[PDB]
Design a protein around this ligand. Structure first.
Ligand SMILES: CC(C)(COP(=O)(O)OP(=O)(O)OC[C@H]1O[C@@H](n2cnc3c(N)ncnc32)[C@H](O)[C@@H]1OP(=O)(O)O)[C@@H](O)C(=O)NCCC(=O)NCCS
Lengths: 1021, 92, 58
């Protein structure tokens, strides 16, 4: 920033970077003296002090030296020293201000008798640029604004010295024009590209040898510090002088300097009976207005606010200092503590009232022990719970807290505790229900607020047409049109985005001040942009001069900087004003309203939503014109918009202090422009000039018949009387209240508090994956490996979901081990090797081989189980079962081997068979099948039970002959096909072994040569 | 019932820029099924609509159908058709 | 029908009777053919009692 400037460092930039033809002399020449140094240190860093004369002033913003004798005029060094002992640091009074005299800007008085300076300088507002030239110096001009040579440098024009010679300098001495003027031209450079507020050099005069300069007074602008590390540099700022501040004010100011949060508590007189510790603007000012115009010049204690979300410990520290205003001290009639607002911001009031809960909950000795009293309020959504928690231990250690809703006005508690009442082609449709807008920026919560404002106002189409950027991709973003999911586009380039979107007319600008110019001026030379709602605050006044001259040329109706919205309800809303939908639907804003406003502040834009919507039928526009002084789309440009429109009927306006501006409204009021009911109010007297104080320009609004009330008190009362008088003749007809439909909450959030219903699919009685461990069938993994079940146990847990006993798991493991690879001639392993040899991957090769396990290959496991099960349960003797299978065809599945027959047993049928003979109780089905074997081996020698027969009969034996299965659970696992699964999970090992082998032996593609095919195609079809 | 009247919310997956099944007609990419058969785009047209979601011209769909007519079977000796004859020969 | 001077009287109940009241309330507001909406708190044939002017309309 840049603000008040320290003139060592401001004159560092000026005297280091000056450039003209006839010389700025006396460069690098400035100094500063205190009693905390000698004359010697400032004498050695500024050595030229031994060459020219000296003038000395208190740099604590103290006025009028020359006639008072705080310059030692024509006095020597030791005279100045033994002058410093009774003046450098003693009291003096000018105007009406006395004080100490410590920081003396000791400055080159150029050795001059009263002929050697020349008067200039220049002040700014928000319109064009005011330069003051004068022949008559002295700080005793008084009315300097009435006799001077004023000149406006207009919108966008540069100084010519011939202009200065022609009509501004009629009254000047000429022998020093050939020096001074070129000199003077460089000094004008100190103004407009420096964006001042107020700048003056006064008394100043011409001779022969030189040009001269003396006395600087300067008020300077800020936020391009990052642009001007090349041209401003590392430049420093003073704070203003006053009394010695009680430490909370300096803690708060340097706390504004430290963090991104802005915490605020500033004292105004320490022995009040009304303390104000407010969070928010409007209630703070009007409560302190009913204080400070009713005698709070003498007692009124403080004013403050806090924002910007400091962390855990930081707001604990600020919080315990605010256990330092009502727990300590006194006023004998009783003291107040004023915390105002209107239903609370976007803090969960657990957050900023974690600030104020942990500001209370603690220290009851040092804020009140001697009688103060709280009332409390705030503005936006989510209030009730933090009001409570401040209540919670502020109550159970005994401190009285009165919490509120908004049934009161801004003036009540200063109304009570003075003993005073009891304690409880340019468009004119800016916004409409068909207005189509652009959001520059990612504001997804308030994108939901604005598309919510498009939906809940019973309107047709969403507010965001594009997000118009340089730095991302082109896509579309998922948002909600009521209940539907819609896709709203986010863009890379801005010429691309204006090329892509011509449905486009109003831009809400979340660009930063780095790219307000390139991106937002690039936007502003795309002609699509009709009202530019700039959430950057302060496109600087020559840049926004290019904008406002372009808003008269290009003509675009700018409702710009620092807007919490330009909200026409029923129709449109810009960002995050009002609160939740509590403030939109509770103020009946879904069918159209009729009453507009222009305000200044946003913290009372909450309560003026509250008032203007709840005392009148609703908001119909809100225009926050800017915190500066030539509005780009003003009061009148929207009064023009509504006075000719046949639907809308009446208007509200606000002000601030010092200067002649509501006099332009009496150029409207005294000349007869406004016939509609108007309601106005002015903010912030606190005089502890005259004109836009509330009294003098509410007078200079009041007189000619365009209406202003007295105060903010009876604004509800006088709006109530004006509204019933304007309904009383039958021009306003009140609407009847309809229930509103919103954000539908979430499926996840309404199920989180459990309110909708939904049936679920996918029943899965197996393997709970969530929780503190991976849980199998019923058992933790540490219990899986701790009870020491192998993979047979977990096949029992996965396929049957039962802990099979320790012999059955080992039997399953042995069956999986003999249903391993049976060589690579067989058909599934063959397709595995063909696919492996085409070099696919593991998983596609294996799975194409496993997709042959059917009925002819590898389906003897289930068939040689179901056939023996259907024979054994429908029981026939095997000497007639084998004949029954003889009588029907259909060979007994699972019997037959090409080689290994008898007196040469199969020796893997034998390993499994002598496993079931040993480790396997209660085995009738194997006894049946072995007796079938004894019958069949008399028919032929080969004719033995296959391993594909024996695993089938032994696994049905395991299932329906051990425990854990009834006969409708065991037979259901056979009818489903859980005997296919044993052969499949076995043969997967052999297939992946074939895959790894065919990759490792590095064989190329197989082709199957043509002398193995024997094509048998038809003759000629 | 709450979504039939619309009050709760649900974000949706499976983004599917293709083939609207719901409503009065089987819409493909952007075209109704009667408009598929009245504009007479063949399976090259529906491969344009399904695969690319673009209406390809009348020489392009004819090339795509000719193209699918030559990329058919290239005999049973080659690797994939061999695995088909093995798996079909296991009677699956 | 704005040439023909019509007045609509509606009395209703059922599934979504209240939000049916809502949605047809805002469309009777949006085109201005006057709809007298009534819910179940009235009698069923009371609306023809007040349609012929034999009892007042709340
Ligand atoms: C030719 C010969 C092999 C017959 O063939 P085969 O025995 O029918 O072939 P198989 O072993 O597969 O079939 C015989 C039995 O096994 C049964 N069988 C075959 N496969 C079966 C299977 N998977 N499941 C259940 N039963 C099956 C058949 O149903 C058949 O039953 P059946 O003979 O009681 O009607 C036999 O006659 C022979 O040995 N000839 C040489 C001896 C000779 O001719 N000597 C002359 C002078 S030395």
């Amino acid at each position: 920033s840049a603000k008040a400037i320290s003139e060592q460092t401001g004159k560092e930039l000026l005297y280091k970077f000056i450039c003209t033809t006839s010389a700025i002399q006396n460069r690098f020449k400035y100094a500063r003296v205190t009693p905390d140094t000698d004359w010697a240190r400032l004498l050695q860093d500024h050595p030229w002090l031994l060459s020219q004369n000296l003038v000395v002033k208190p740099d604590q913003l103290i006025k009028r030296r020359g006639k008072l004798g705080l310059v030692g005029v024509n006095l020597t060094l030791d005279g100045v020293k033994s002058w410093l002992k009774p003046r450098l640091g003693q009291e003096a009074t000018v105007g009406k201000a006395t004080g100490f005299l410590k920081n003396f800007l000791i400055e080159p008085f150029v050795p001059h008798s009263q002929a050697e300076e020349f008067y200039v300088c220049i002040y700014a507002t928000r319109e064009g640029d005011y330069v003051l030239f004068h022949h008559e110096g002295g700080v005793d001009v008084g009315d300097v604004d009435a006799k001077a040579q004023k000149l406006l440098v207009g919108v966008d024009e540069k100084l010519n010295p011939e202009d200065i010679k022609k009509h501004l300098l009629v009254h000047a001495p000429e022998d020093k024009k050939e020096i001074l003027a070129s000199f003077i031209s460089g000094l004008f450079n100190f103004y407009e590209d420096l964006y001042f507020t107020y700048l003056e050099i006064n008394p100043l005069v011409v001779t022969k040898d030189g040009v001269y300069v003396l006395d600087l007074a300067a008020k300077v602008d800020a936020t391009a510090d990052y642009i001007c590390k090349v041209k401003w540099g590392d430049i420093e700022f003073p704070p203003p002088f006053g009394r010695e501040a009680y430490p909370e004010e300096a803690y708060i100011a340097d706390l504004d300097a430290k963090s991104g949060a802005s915490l605020k508590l500033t004292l105004l007189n320490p022995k009040g009976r009304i303390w104000t510790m407010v969070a928010g603007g409007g209630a703070s000012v009007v409560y302190s207005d009913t204080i400070c115009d009713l005698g709070g010049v003498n007692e009124l204690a403080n004013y403050g606010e806090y924002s910007g979300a400091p962390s855990e410990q930081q707001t604990y520290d600020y919080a315990k200092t605010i256990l330092s205003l009502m727990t300590r001290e006194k006023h004998p009639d009783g003291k107040i503590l004023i915390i105002g607002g209107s239903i609370a911001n976007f803090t969960n009031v657990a957050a900023t009232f974690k600030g104020i809960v942990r500001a209370i909950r603690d220290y009851q000795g040092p804020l009140k022990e001697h009688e103060v009293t709280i009332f409390v309020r705030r503005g936006g959504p989510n209030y009730q719970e933090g009001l409570r928690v401040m209540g919670e231990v502020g109550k159970t250690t005994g401190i009285p807290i009165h919490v509120f809703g908004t049934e009161t006005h801004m003036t009540a508690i200063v109304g009570m505790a003075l003993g005073h009442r009891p304690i409880p082609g340019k468009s004119t449709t800016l916004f409409s229900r068909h207005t189509k807008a652009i959001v520059w920026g990612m504001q997804t919560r308030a994108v939901q607020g604005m598309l919510d404002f498009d939906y809940v106002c019973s309107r047709d189409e969403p507010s965001v047409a594009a997000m118009v950027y340089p730095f991302t991709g082109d896509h579309k973003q998922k948002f909600y049109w009521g209940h539907k999911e819609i896709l709203i586009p986010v863009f890379k380039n801005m010429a691309d985005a204006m090329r892509k979107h011509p449905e486009v007319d109003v831009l809400i600008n979340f660009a930063s001040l780095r790219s307000a110019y390139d991106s937002t001026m690039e936007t502003m030379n795309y002609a699509q942009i009709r009202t530019i709602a700039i959430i950057a605050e302060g496109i600087p006044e020559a840049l926004t001069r290019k904008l406002i001259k372009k808003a008269d040329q290009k003509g675009v109706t700018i409702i710009g900087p620092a807007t919490v919205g330009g909200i026409k309800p029923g129709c449109f809303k810009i960002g995050n004003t009002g609160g939740m939908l509590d403030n939109i639907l509770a103020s009946k804003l879904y069918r159209p309203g009729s009453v507009a406003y222009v305000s200044r502040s946003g913290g009372m834009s909450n309560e003026l939503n509250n008032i203007i919507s709840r005392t009148t039928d609703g908001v119909y526009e809100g225009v926050a014109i800017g915190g500066d002084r030539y509005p780009g789309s003003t009061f009148m440009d929207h009064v023009l918009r509504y006075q000719d429109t046949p639907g809308v009927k009446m208007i509200v306006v606000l002000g601030e202090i010092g200067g002649t501006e509501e006099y332009k409204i009496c150029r409207g009021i005294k000349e007869g422009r406004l016939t509609k009911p108007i309601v106005c109010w002015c903010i912030g007297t606190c005089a502890t000039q005259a004109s836009e104080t509330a009294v003098a320009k509410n007078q200079a609004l009041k007189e000619a018949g365009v209406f202003v009330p007295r105060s903010f008190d009876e604004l509800g009362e006088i709006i109530q009387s004006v509204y019933e008088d304007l309904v009383a003749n039958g021009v306003i007809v009140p609407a009847q209240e309809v229930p509103p439909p919103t954000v539908p909450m979430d499926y996840s959030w309404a199920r989180e508090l459990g309110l909708i219903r939904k049936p679920a699919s996918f029943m899965t009685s197996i393997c709970d994956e969530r929780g503190q461990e991976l849980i199998y069938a019923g058992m933790p993994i540490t219990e899986v490996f701790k009870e020491e079940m192998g993979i047979g146990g977990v096949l029992g847990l996965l396929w049957f979901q039962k802990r099979l006993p320790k012999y059955s798991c080992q039997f399953i493991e042995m069956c999986l081990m003999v249903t391993a690879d049976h060589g690579p001639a067989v058909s599934g392993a063959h397709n595995t090797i063909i696919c492996a040899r085409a070099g696919k991957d593991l998983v596609s090769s294996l799975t194409s081989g496993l997709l042959t396990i059917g009925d002819r290959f590898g389906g003897a496991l289930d068939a040689a189980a179901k056939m023996f099960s259907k024979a054994f349960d429908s029981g026939i003797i095997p000497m007639e079962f084998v004949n029954k299978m003889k009588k029907e065809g259909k060979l007994i599945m699972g019997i037959g081997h090409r080689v290994k027959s008898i007196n040469n047993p199969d020796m893997r049928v034998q390993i499994l068979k002598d496993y079931v003979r040993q480790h396997f109780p209660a085995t009738p089905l194997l006894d049946y099948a072995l007796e079938v074997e004894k019958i069949t081996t008399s028919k032929k020698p080969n004719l033995i039970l296959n391993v594909d027969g024996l695993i089938g009969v032994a696994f049905v034996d395991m299932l329906r002959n051990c425990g854990s299965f009834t006969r409708e659970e065991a037979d259901e696992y056979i009818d489903i096909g859980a005997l296919n699964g044993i052969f499949v999970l076995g043969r997967s090992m052999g297939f992946i072994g074939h895959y790894l082998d065919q990759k490792r032996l590095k064989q190329g593609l197989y082709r199957h040569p043509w002398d193995d095919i024997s094509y048998v195609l038809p003759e000629h079809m």
